[PDB]
């Protein structure tokens, strides 16, 4: 029962981290795009 | 005469005014004026209408609006040849060491176009790096640019100050550019190479923090002019024409953080981390130069090392991914490993070199792939570590050799071990020969073993040196000899 | 023409030239070098009274304000013909191999064409018939379309482009054309040369079937930006033959940032994250003219990396948007002896449907990746409790999911000298009836090996038989 | 040498002096209040034809536009010498404290000043004596070196500086000085001049051996950008006379926000996060000049508060970029009575390594610290387990692990008069061979209570066998 119990939270963490690494990433981009935005809004 | 007055000067920055038939990377003169008898230098980057932009290699604080510039002919130069072995120089060229002018004859140009694509030919010869991880797991290659990628304090310039003294009879003339790094730094660094003995085939181009902008743009590229003086001639090295030539970029990410720098304040439109555009084609020219050139060509080489501070491993980070696709090898140093202990913190399971075994001698390739395959397996199962009890006989055992591969390629610094002590140690060690020796104490064992090969067993070492080209490598009686001196070692020691 | 430079910004220049005769957008002005060398600007912008801003595409370090400038008049001319077979090119179409100029009795057409117009695009999707089982089964071609690879280098990618050209050579009109974009002076040309040199079929080297334009790392972002545009104008002359043609970009995601690079150089404003604002239009430039048309298709296969691994990038995002395939290199399956380490489950493609391939082969495919799917799951299984605790009709499908992955590998006729084994070119219908009757439970008493660098179903039947 | 206020805009002022008599880029400008005062100026950006950029250093609510200005020829002129000690100033030289002005007597000196060169750097590090045994183990000082705190407030850290102070100038002459950068009047000021005023040392002041240049937060940005070479430049005096001499900057964050403001008020392109494109140059104009001659050194123990607690920005990573150790002050050893809250662990230093300090202290730092490694990670098996009734060795390594915790303590001279106990100064070689004494065993059979504050291992077996 624990085999089966730590295999789903393993199999649920697994999901979670590519869910958070799909949030993560557009956390990243936003980011870029963000400083692209004021440097460029300050270059000018 | 066409000159040119200074009509602005901002932070390190002049505007030159009317000085037509400037070259777009000439070196102005500033001549001396009243209060001032020396001349400042300046590079003009921005040839606009009716201005000319030029950064200021020397100190910004004395040219005042209204002094007279000459345009001097000449295209950035720098001097190049047997003269600067063994002393720390601008990127200009002038010493800094205070042990008096360069001596030389022939000025190789900065900025030249890489050989080519036909010049070049495939890297087979390798560069001894001294360090069993790098020297095993990442083979570096005369003409291959190898990275070392790490995050602020975790050895990086120590790797590269391990390599650059593990040279000191393999034929390389080691160059160290040390872009940004403090005056201390820098100064320790030459120290260190003077107290080995380093520093007779070694020159330290030096553009500290200090210094202007410009001095840090230009450093890499005056270290690279000097490389390729002796990738192409050559100079004299222990009596024999040495041809090859290993350089070091102590930071790239602080030559790019100058030339942003240099970038912003000539008004150039910024990018991403408002680096310009065209910083991927600065560190491309840099680092492209460093070239394997064939029997054609003089056979020379021109091994680079790239040096970038990382923060928090921020891998995705512009300059770090820039300089990693221009590479041909990443080494990682990851500061999690420096802080758990293992002091030469290569990040394996994502360090590469692309060139691979082509860059190993053929001893070292067939005793290192074994070490590459039981410290993969062993990272594999890094989570069942603090299990160990509990676990299946070969996966236990599996454990306890990937600790005791890990714990071997430890290594301490300025102790670069030759080739064939250290394929002797991995041969001991892929062999099952150090089982019976606990963890804590591989290093101790590595060391006693390597002493007694050097004082008892000269000949095995020898037979080893002698025979590394083989491609059969164990198959020699070398293999017996070097059998018998693990078992007399073992025999005799006790752990 | 005869105009003068007026400003040497970086890579980016402005030349002044009279009120008239101002050159057009992608021109490409040419600045005399003091001697038999040129600098090869192409224009990007008209500005005011004569003004027009270019990207050098050159070292512009020695050049002055004031020096003449020579308009030619057309877009980048890049040779054409087969004069360019077997020689290496930049992106200005000069030759940076050995042998010598290309000469002036070979056509040169500009480098800025236009896509084919839309009567000319095939109406239907042909099946591309590479003859590698893999490719051909799990992720099939598509004549005419775009085709995306992914891996580190060091998974046999070489070879698989070297099995494609040589593939297309022997059994079609077979000429291939590749774009080094961003391309690594020493890894990346001295290699593939002596790789294309030494790889040869029926008494004719790889490197003579194929014409390589090598836009360089370390030139500006010019050289390569329009390096894939010198490739397409290559190889859009043999299409206009009605050959069919590989255009084998590599590492597409450099000629975004390529571009990227010059849209900042030129100071327009950034998009998302940092990219240019015309990332559609400039990846619609490229990627348009590979197409199926009546005379003739181009199919290309191009490498793409994936900025981070992240795929919503705007880059791979715009790439994906124009790609037809996507074949999955994959380091572990490389790791075991299988030169062709194209992972089934990741490679997928768009004309692996029924309205296309037949029935029987999506049929097939389907199963294929189902088994293999069930593999794949079952894999933590195995690794924890083993392969006795895995009950009946799983264990048949295990075993079945491991002999055909490593039915997959398959002699390369390009590798017949490393290897010694001879290449084995399969047809889509006879791997699709070999894997067909692979599943339905013939060969089941044969073991794994038998399978191993072998070919179609009977050759693995003689095999177990001898 | 006079010139006119063209523009007022915040703390940034325009200047047009005559074509031929502009002041240099570094010069002050001091315009003249109407009530007898002036208000000094620095000039940053020669532009156009006799006009000048200065940022204000003052409040600039009170100027028309057309004030005149007097051009001084030099920069910042800032009192240094002997009476220059044991006093309070500002950015200008200018002491704020209740006494009288500096008499004219005293040498004004450039507060711009190139680093020492190349040829004058020591060429081995040299570990700096504080005296301190956690602060000499585990993270050693550089002479002419510079380290960072990275503690709050009530973790001791003015009495950590109080005590370098103290030190330095008993077994050396040690002046100090103290530069203000940025920081909270409350905390900089009232708080350190009173507990240094109060903190004495053989019937001489803290204060009085210290010098004290203080740019608060409320200053504009041009003072907390230059208050640091104000407080070099008064180092440095010191330093050519021969003194060693420990400068604390207090937030040096501070002064590269101040930068950062400066850069954006003057126009200036942003450069990563609204930071000044002139960051590594800024960091560098200021951190070289510390550093060890062989005349003197110049040690220098830095205070950096990081935004958040994000080390990926740009003026951390710019501030650490030039560091030698790093000292992590933590809440939980200051509330546990022990008054040197320098965590063994976080505490880093370049020095310790054996080609420097020395093959003991290297090995006795290593054996000391790898108990500690796991920051006693047995703590979480007691708490769950009720140490299990037994933990066989592991009980020896974490009453040894304890004992180092309480024995890292050291009594400071400065809080002699708080909590009546003398202080002891422990060099570095009686903590290398304590510590060794203590890892061989020889501080076993002693309980604890024994080890908290004490000098010597040896003053810890008086106390056991009295
Ligand atoms: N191989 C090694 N053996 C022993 N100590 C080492 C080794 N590598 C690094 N260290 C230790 O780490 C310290 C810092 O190393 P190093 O100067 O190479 O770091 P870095 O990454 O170049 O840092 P920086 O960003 O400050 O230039 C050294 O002073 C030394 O104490
Ligand atoms: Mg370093």
Redesign the interface.
Known sequence: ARMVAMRNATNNAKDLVRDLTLSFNKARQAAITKEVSEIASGAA | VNVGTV??????VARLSGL??????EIVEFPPKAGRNESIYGIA?????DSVAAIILG????????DMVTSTGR?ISVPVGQGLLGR?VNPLGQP???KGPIVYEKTRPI?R??????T????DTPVQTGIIAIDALIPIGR???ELIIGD??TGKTAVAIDTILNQKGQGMVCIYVAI?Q???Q???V??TL?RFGAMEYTIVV?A??????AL?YIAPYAGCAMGEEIMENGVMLNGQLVKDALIVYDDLS?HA??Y??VS??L????????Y???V??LH??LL??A??LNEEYGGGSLTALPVI?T??N???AYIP?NVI??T?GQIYLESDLFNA?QRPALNVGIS?S???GAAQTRAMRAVAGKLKGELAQFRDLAAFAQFASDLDATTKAQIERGQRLQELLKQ???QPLPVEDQVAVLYAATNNYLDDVPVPLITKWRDDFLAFLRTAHPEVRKLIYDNRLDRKFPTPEVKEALEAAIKEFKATSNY | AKGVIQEIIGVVIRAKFPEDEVPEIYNAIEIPLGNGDRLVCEVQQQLGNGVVKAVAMGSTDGLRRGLEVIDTGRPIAVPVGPATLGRVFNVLGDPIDGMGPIGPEVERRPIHRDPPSFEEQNTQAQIFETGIKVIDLIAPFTRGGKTAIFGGAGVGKTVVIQELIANIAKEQSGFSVFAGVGERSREGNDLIHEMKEARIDENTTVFDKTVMVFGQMNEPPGARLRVGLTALTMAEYFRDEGRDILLFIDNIFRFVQAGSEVSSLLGRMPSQVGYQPTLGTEMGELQERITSTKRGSITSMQAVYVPADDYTDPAPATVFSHLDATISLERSIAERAIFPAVDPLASTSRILDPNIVGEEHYRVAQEVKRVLQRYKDLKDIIAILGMEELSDEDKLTVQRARKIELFFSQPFTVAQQFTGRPGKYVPVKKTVESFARLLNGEGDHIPESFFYMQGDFDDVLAAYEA
């Not at chain 2, 176009?113 to 036909?118: D, S």
Request: aromatic share 2%; charged share 30%.
């Open positions: 009509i602005a000067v901002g932070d390190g037509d038939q400037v070259v777009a990377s980057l921005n040839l606009e209408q100190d910004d604080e004395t040219i005042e609006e209204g295209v720390v800094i060491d205070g900025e176009i890489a050989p080519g694509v036909i070049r030919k495939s890297v003409g291959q640019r602020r304090q940004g403090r005056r201390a820098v100064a320790q030459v120290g003077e030096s500290t923090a200090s210094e202007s902008a840090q602080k953080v100058a942003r720098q912003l304040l008004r150039r439109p910024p990018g991403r981390e408002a310009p555009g065209d991927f084609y491309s020219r492209e130069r070239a394997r501070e923060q928090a921020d891998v995705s991914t696709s221009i041909d202990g590469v692309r060139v691979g301490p610094q300025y």
